[PDB]
C-alpha cells in the first residue's frame, strides 16, 4: 500500500525460516507429498513470490519503494542448507553474522568479508 | 558438521600428515650428517677450550 501510494516502506520478515516450517506443516497436513528435508516442492516459490514484491517504483507509478530485510537462521553456520540457499539466491545482498566474530568482540558480527550488496556504489551518500 | 565440511577437513589433515612424514625423513638425514660432522668438531672445540679450564 505504501509503495503504491508514493510513500516509502521498510518490511522486516523475522524469520522466514519459520514461515517455511509453518508452510511445511500445512502442506504435510493437507497430504501433499513432501520434498527435500520434508519441505514441499513449492518452498522456493513461497519466498520468491514474497520477496519479489519489494520493488522501487519509477516516478510514473508514484515513485514509492518497499525495502525488505528478511531474516534467516542457519544451523551452526551451515549456510549451505536448503532454505538459506534458496533465500540467498532470491535476495540482492546479504549480511553474514558469525558467532566466532560475536564472541571475539566484534559486534555487530557482520562478516564484512562475505557480506555483499549488488547496488553497492549506487544508494550511498557521496561523503560515505 | 556436514559431509562436505568433514571431507575437506579430512583431506587437509591427510596432506598435513604426508608433509610432516616427509619432513621427519629429511630432518633425520640431516641429523645423521650433522652428527657425523660433529664428532671431529667436538674434539676440536674441546681442545680449544682446554687452556681456560687447565689454567
Amino acid at each position: 500500500y505504501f509503495r503504491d501510494n508514493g510513500k516509502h516502506a521498510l518490511i522486516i520478515y523475522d524469520d522466514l525460516s519459520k514461515q517455511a516450517v509453518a508452510y511445511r506443516q500445512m502442506s504435510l497436513l493437507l497430504r501433499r507429498p513432501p520434498g527435500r528435508e520434508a519441505y514441499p516442492g513449492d518452498v522456493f516459490y513461497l519466498h520468491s513470490r514474497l520477496l519479489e514484491r519489494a520493488a522501487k517504483m519509477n516516478d510514473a507509478f508514484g515513485g514509492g519503494s518497499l525495502t525488505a530485510l528478511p531474516v534467516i537462521e542457519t544451523q551452526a553456520g551451515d549456510v549451505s542448507a536448503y532454505i538459506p540457499t534458496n533465500v540467498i539466491s532470491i535476495t540482492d545482498g546479504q549480511i553474514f553474522l558469525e558467532t566466532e566474530l560475536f564472541y571475539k568482540g566484534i559486534r555487530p558480527a557482520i562478516n564484512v568479508g562475505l557480506s555483499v550488496s549488488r547496488v553497492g556504489s549506487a544508494a550511498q551518500t557521496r561523503a560515505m | 558438521a556436514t559431509l562436505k565440511d568433514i571431507t575437506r577437513r579430512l583431506k587437509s589433515i591427510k596432506n598435513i600428515q604426508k608433509i610432516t612424514k616427509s619432513m621427519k625423513m629429511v630432518a633425520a638425514a640431516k641429523y645423521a650428517r650433522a652428527e657425523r660432522e660433529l664428532k671431529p668438531a667436538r674434539v676440536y672445540g674441546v681442545g680449544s677450550l682446554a687452556l681456560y679450564e687447565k689454567a
Partner: protein, 47 residues
C-alpha cells in the same frame, strides 16, 4: 576416501588462513624490495 593437492587451503580452517598469511607477508616484502629496485633503476636510467 583420498586426499588431493591444494586441500589445506580448500578446507579454510586454521591452517588455510595461516598459510595464506605466511604467503602474503613474504610476497609483500619481496614486492617492496622489487619496487625499491625499480625506482632505483628508473632514476639511474633517466640520463
Amino acid at each position: 576416501v583420498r586426499s588431493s593437492a591444494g586441500a589445506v587451503r580448500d578446507a579454510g580452517g586454521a591452517f588455510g588462513k595461516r598459510e595464506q598469511a605466511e604467503e602474503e607477508r613474504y610476497f609483500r616484502a619481496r614486492a617492496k624490495e622489487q619496487l625499491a629496485a625499480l625506482k632505483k633503476h628508473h632514476e639511474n636510467e633517466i640520463s
